[PDB]
Ligand binder design. Structure first.
Ligand code: ANP
Ligand code: MG
Length: 299
């Protein structure tokens, strides 16, 4: 079973090498995710167009095709357009356009090593991008879509440096909450799981607001939630450590020293505050995607 949502010319030219299991073994691996896997491949029919193939493993439910077909027909400037969905018997393949710039996670880890640099105006453009893509999913699409796995690795940068959200969360395809929490630890991505999910086992729109709030803090602090710096600190979490520095009398301490003297301190401090409201322990106290965008665009 195969469905296409984007002008890739022949349905057979893309199909042939994905059905061949031995064909993936020689493809380059761009994104390591354990169970989930992403490959790098050149589309044969196109004139040298590189694509990214996400491999998700399902653990007679056709609801996967129903939701993915909805995901495939979503078009937004800040959402990575799904190109094709291949459904094997016990596996699924998602086809995206390969972005040379990588993901937000890839860049931020490269900024730590100094192999890359990202200035605040770009981070501000990324935040506004994710905010625009979130509001469309939460309050503009005809069925309300919830991205249940929002993280900097699922925010890709195009050649215009606009954030694009990918690897959407599919309620039918996702594993049980207890396992999902377990692999979230090994992947170092627990920090994006809202506190309520531990008692609800259901992803809400406020869970997307929580994951977004962490990303806003990362863009200013420059450290990831899995950073061992936070495992030596007093609060033992990026969200709580950021919250106390906000209310401290020296809030600039949380700012990455790489964007200090650029004159964006006042702007970055306002982003930290919006990250606090998006990451409050009570989801009812958190803003929605519409108000989050308005606060980010007010600077
Ligand atoms: N269209 C794409 N273009 C370029 N790189 C991509 C693309 N999609 C994914 N990647 C890379 O894949 C990496 C993440 O791989 P992935 O298996 O999706 O783990 P994850 O995103 O952290 N969790 P999840 O996607 O929710 O299962 C990203 O950092 C990218 O480098
Ligand atoms: Mg990804």
């Amino acid at each position: 079973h195969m469905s296409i949502f984007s002008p890739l010319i022949k349905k057979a030219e893309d199909l042939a090498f994905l059905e061949n299991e031995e064909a993936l073994a020689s493809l380059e691996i761009i994104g390591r995710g354990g169970c989930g896997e992403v490959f790098k491949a050149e589309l044969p029919g196109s004139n040298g167009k590189i694509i990214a193939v996400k491999k998700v493993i399902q653990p007679k439910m056709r609801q996967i095709r129903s939701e993915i077909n909805t995901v495939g027909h979503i078009r937004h400037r800040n959402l990575l357009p799904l190109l094709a969905h291949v459904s094997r018997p016990e596996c699924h393949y998602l086809v995206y356009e390969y972005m040379e710039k990588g993901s937000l996670q890839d860049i931020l880890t490269d900024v730590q090593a100094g192999n890359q640099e990202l200035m605040w105006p770009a981070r501000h453009k990324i935040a506004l991008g994710i905010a625009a893509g979130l509001e469309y999913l939460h309050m503009d699409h005809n069925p309300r879509i919830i991205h249940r796995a929002l993280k900097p690795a699922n925010v890709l940068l195009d050649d215009d440096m606009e954030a694009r959200i990918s690897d959407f969360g599919l309620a039918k395809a996702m594993p049980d909450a207890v396992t999902h929490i377990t692999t979230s630890h090994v992947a170092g991505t627990v920090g994006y799981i809202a506190p309520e999910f531990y008692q609800t086992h259901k992803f809400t729109d406020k869970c997307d607001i929580y994951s977004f709030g962490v990303i806003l803090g990362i863009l200013v602090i420059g450290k990831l939630p899995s950073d061992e710096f936070f495992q030596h600190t007093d609060e033992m979490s990026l969200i709580k450590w950021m919250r106390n520095i906000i209310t401290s009398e020296n809030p600039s301490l949380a700012i990455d020293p790489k964007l200090m003297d650029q004159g964006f301190d006042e702007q970055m401090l306002l982003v930290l505050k919006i990250a606090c409201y998006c990451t409050l322990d009570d989801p009812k106290q958190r803003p929605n995607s519409k108000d989050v965008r308005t606060m980010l665009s007010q600077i």
